[PDB]
Design a protein around this nucleic acid. Structure first.
Ligand code: MG
Ligand code: MG
Ligand code: MG
Ligand code: MG
Ligand code: MG
Ligand code: MG
Ligand code: MG
Ligand code: MG
Ligand code: MG
Ligand code: MG
Ligand code: MG
Ligand code: MG
Ligand code: MG
Ligand code: MG
Ligand code: MG
Ligand code: MG
Ligand code: MG
Ligand code: MG
Ligand code: MG
Ligand code: MG
Ligand code: MG
Ligand code: MG
Ligand code: MG
Ligand code: MG
Ligand code: MG
Ligand code: MG
Ligand code: MG
Ligand code: MG
Ligand code: MG
Ligand code: MG
Ligand code: MG
Ligand code: MG
Ligand code: MG
Ligand code: MG
Ligand code: MG
Ligand code: MG
Ligand code: MG
Ligand code: MG
Ligand code: MG
Ligand code: MG
Lengths: 55, 142, 103, 110, 117
RNA sequence: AGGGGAGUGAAAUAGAACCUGAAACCGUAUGCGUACAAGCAGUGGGAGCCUACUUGUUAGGUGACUGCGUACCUUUUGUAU
RNA sequence: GGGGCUCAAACCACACACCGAAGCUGCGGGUGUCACGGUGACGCGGUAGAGGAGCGUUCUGUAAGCCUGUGAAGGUG
């Protein structure tokens, strides 16, 4: 099955009105001042005020 | 020198009250639809609402002639197969008295966005009083 | 203080000191013209309805300019019959200024 | 001010890249870098270097401050595309278009 | 003498696409659709110069009816009484007095009514 | 890779995929319209808003609301078909 | 066609009025034929098809001319 008519410029842009992206929840580790993902270990290696992996 | 045209921000609307107390249904509805549209004013233009506000008080006492009290039917379809439904004039008067007058007036108005704005200015009640005392309607015969 | 006059096959409601465009007249620019085919004269609240025309009334005007209206385009098309025709048109007019209305 | 930085022929489709472009439009460069650093999209990694290059151009060539800048203009234009051949069933041949795009980011301190 | 079509053909498509300004979708930006749209627009314009004269007379008559019934007369009797007396004023001017010069309209209806028509 | 300056040049939006660089097609910005409304998407009438300036019988941009209105070619006795 | 219509907004007679087309008239323009020496009168829907008159493009002569870096052709308003 295929279209009998080609879609218009407006018609295919209304379908894409739901394609936007959402942002993530970011937090600032107050001990260091570093931005990280919420509930995740920072790229440095801190979580909730403690060293976990130390690179 | 161009023809005058009425502007929606300048029209003067007035309130009237009509009593259906032994009135022929269709002959009462032709005067109501005339007032709702603005045909009685020299400022009438086809594309703006220049009508008046009509209140009907004794809806359930409207009258028909001949044998239409039992033989007049109202049909509507629900959208489902076999969904045709009918009711006659007696049962509708007892159930929803105002729907009789609204249905007759609605069919005498244009079927477009402007014609739905004229319908919004018609108030029909089944008692002897209305809640629009603040607007001060005045009597209108027939 | 207005009047109704007939000129060019049409009727115009006319006030004093007014500019209006009318069908072309064979009068030189800047020349005075008058209309004795006056149908109605109303001075304030006093109206003189003209049986045929109002007796004695006249409206004095002077010619301002001559010109042509904007071009309108005529097209005559008969679908799937192999026929088409085009045309242009600009209508002549004379602009007059209404100097005085004498009832 | 309104200093710019362009990346020509980035190997990604313009429609894919425009989803990240309008996530940072009008934001401060401080919080626009945090969004791009923690995004899961490939276009965010590409567009992050164009945004930092614009900031560096601002500090060096115009003597600006990163704390004062904001993303004033961003858009994605189409580039030239490579054309390839994809074999299908029963001897049929398809043509593959590998699209690219131009990314322009502008930062302004006003 | 080989003749190339490039300059003349482009200058002819741009004339049509300039008249299709403001149309929707392909009707304003591709020549095949826009050419049909411009012809149909001209067809409507020729027809609607006839209909403009009809639509305005139907509006003057409706307003004269509304203003005559306020003075106690119907439109069809007012026109019969204006012909009977002498008055030969346009419907366009009559509908103008109905809205603006309401006192002058009453004197005309009263004059027509004195002709018993 | 690609850019931002600086330099050469009469001219780099003449920078090597380099004279000019149109159309389809894809974007960013501004103005107006659009979430109770039914159909070849225009045309006749028409308010409101925005811009410019000659400050409203003006010019330009939008077109709420409303009358009318079933593409083009070919082939046919005959096509919205 | 719908709303709705019952001493009708139905039917049968008679009467007067009005609406109603690109029909006719009014005003302003353009054209074909004929007659007279610019005026008159009488036309101007149209497929296949016949007849008449023109626009624009490239090249040759006019031109060893004329225009043009104080800006050509081309592109865009
Ligand atoms: Mg389809
Ligand atoms: Mg098909
Ligand atoms: Mg849809
Ligand atoms: Mg999608
Ligand atoms: Mg209708
Ligand atoms: Mg094989
Ligand atoms: Mg494809
Ligand atoms: Mg438009
Ligand atoms: Mg365009
Ligand atoms: Mg230099
Ligand atoms: Mg250039
Ligand atoms: Mg160049
Ligand atoms: Mg190129
Ligand atoms: Mg060269
Ligand atoms: Mg080039
Ligand atoms: Mg282009
Ligand atoms: Mg878009
Ligand atoms: Mg926008
Ligand atoms: Mg509703
Ligand atoms: Mg709406
Ligand atoms: Mg729809
Ligand atoms: Mg409908
Ligand atoms: Mg208009
Ligand atoms: Mg305007
Ligand atoms: Mg419209
Ligand atoms: Mg419309
Ligand atoms: Mg229609
Ligand atoms: Mg066949
Ligand atoms: Mg057949
Ligand atoms: Mg078809
Ligand atoms: Mg047909
Ligand atoms: Mg078909
Ligand atoms: Mg008549
Ligand atoms: Mg007519
Ligand atoms: Mg005729
Ligand atoms: Mg004539
Ligand atoms: Mg002919
Ligand atoms: Mg004829
Ligand atoms: Mg120049
Ligand atoms: Mg040449």
């Amino acid at each position: 099955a295929v279209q009998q008519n080609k879609k218009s410029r407006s018609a295919r842009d209304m379908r894409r009105s739901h394609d936007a992206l959402e942002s993530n929840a970011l937090s600032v580790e107050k001990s260091t001042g570093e931005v990280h993902l919420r509930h995740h270990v920072s790229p440095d290696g801190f979580y909730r005020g403690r060293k976990v992996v130390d690179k | 020198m161009k023809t005058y045209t009425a502007k929606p921000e300048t029209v003067q609307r007035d309130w009237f009250v009509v009593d259906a107390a032994g009135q022929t249904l269709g002959r009462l509805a032709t005067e109501i639809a005339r007032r709702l549209r603005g045909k009685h004013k020299p400022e009438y233009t086809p594309h703006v609402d220049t009508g008046d506000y009509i209140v009907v008080i004794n809806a359930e006492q409207v009258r028909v002639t001949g044998a239409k009290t039992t033989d007049k039917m109202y049909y509507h379809h629900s959208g489902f197969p076999g969904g045709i439904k009918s009711i006659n004039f007696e049962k509708l008067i007892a159930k929803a008295p105002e729907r009789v007058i609204e249905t007759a007036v609605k069919g005498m108005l244009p079927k477009n966005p402007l014609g739905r704005d004229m319908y919004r200015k018609l108030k029909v009640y089944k008692g002897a009083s209305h809640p629009h005392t603040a607007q001060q309607p005045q009597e209108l015969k027939i | 203080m207005y009047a109704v006059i007939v000129t060019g096959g049409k009727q115009h409601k006319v006030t004093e000191g007014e500019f209006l465009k009318v069908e072309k007249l064979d009068v030189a620019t800047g020349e005075a013209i008058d209309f004795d085919r006056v149908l109605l004269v109303a001075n304030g609240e006093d109206v003189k309805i003209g049986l045929p025309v109002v007796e004695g009334a006249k409206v004095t005007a002077e010619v301002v300019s001559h010109g042509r209206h904007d071009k309108v385009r005529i097209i005559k098309f008969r679908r799937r019959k192999h026929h088409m025709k085009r045309q242009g048109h600009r209508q002549w007019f004379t602009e007059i200024k209404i100097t005085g209305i004498q009832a | 001010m309104e200093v710019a930085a362009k990346l020509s022929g980035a190997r990604i489709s313009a429609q894919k890249a425009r989803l990240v472009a309008d996530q940072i439009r009008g934001k401060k460069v401080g919080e626009a870098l945090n969004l791009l650093a923690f995004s899961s999209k490939k276009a965010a990694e590409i567009m992050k270097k164009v945004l930092e290059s614009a900031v560096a151009n601002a500090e060096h060539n115009e003597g600006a401050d990163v704390d004062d800048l904001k993303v004033s203009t961003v858009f994605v234009n189409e580039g030239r595309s490579l054309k390839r051949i994809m074999p299908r069933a029963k001897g049929r041949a398809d043509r593959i278009v590998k699209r690219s795009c131009h990314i322009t980011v502008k930062v302004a301190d006003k | 003498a080989r003749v190339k079509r490039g300059v003349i053909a482009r200058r002819r498509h741009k004339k049509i696409l300039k008249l299709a300004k403001g149309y929707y979708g392909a009707r304003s930006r591709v020549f095949r659709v826009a050419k049909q749209a411009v012809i149909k627009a001209g067809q409507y314009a020729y027809r609607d110069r006839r209909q403009r004269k009809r639509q305005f007379r139907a509006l003057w008559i409706a307003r004269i009816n509304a203003g005559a019934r306020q003075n106690g007369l119907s439109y069809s009797r007012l026109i019969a009484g204006l012909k009977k007396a002498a008055i030969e004023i346009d419907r366009k001017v009559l509908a103008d007095l109905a809205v603006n010069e309401k006192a002058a309209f009453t004197a005309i209806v009263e004059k027509a009514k004195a002709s018993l028509a």
